[PDB]
Design goal:
The structure is cut from a larger assembly and holds 2 copies of chain A. With 51 residues, chain A is mostly loops. Chain A is built from 1 helix and no strands. Chain A has one helix spanning 29-32. The longest helix of chain A is centred in the middle third of the chain and has 4 residues, at 29-32. The chains hardly touch. Chain B: This is Capsid vertex protein. Chain B: Homopentamer. Interacts with the portal protein. Interacts with the major capsid protein that forms 160 hexamers.
Chain lengths: 51, 52
């Protein structure tokens, strides 16, 4: 089975240190990492679950 | 392993045979990674953005 998708980032999400540009590739996560505006992450620190 | 337990991915760039060549995250290997080169743990593969 073969499935093909795009999985690109939303616009207005220019990569850091490049900023002003017009051919931004919204697929390379390495440039887009953290440089988004429509999604805000927040981790949580909790005690472990003993197994 | 159960698909719905690990959360890892094998179909795609991660691959399975590819995981053989990937460096293993160890207490010694942590202070050697650089930009680019991947690393796996619990058969979940990451890649390092920021150097060291």
């Amino acid at each position: 089975l073969l499935v093909r998708y795009a999985l690109s980032a939303n616009p207005y999400t220019v990569a850091k240190d490049e900023k002003e540009a017009r051919i931004i590739d919204g697929g390379d996560m390495d440039k887009m990492a953290g440089r988004s505006d429509l999604s805000v992450l927040l981790g949580v620190k909790l005690p472990k679950i003993i197994i | 392993e159960f698909t719905f337990k690990t959360g890892a991915t094998y179909a795609g760039e991660a691959g399975y045979v590819d995981r053989e060549q990937i460096t293993e995250l160890t207490e010694e290997s942590k202070l050697t990674l650089n930009k680019g080169d991947l690393f796996k743990y619990n058969n979940i593969v990451y890649k390092v953005l920021e150097d060291t």
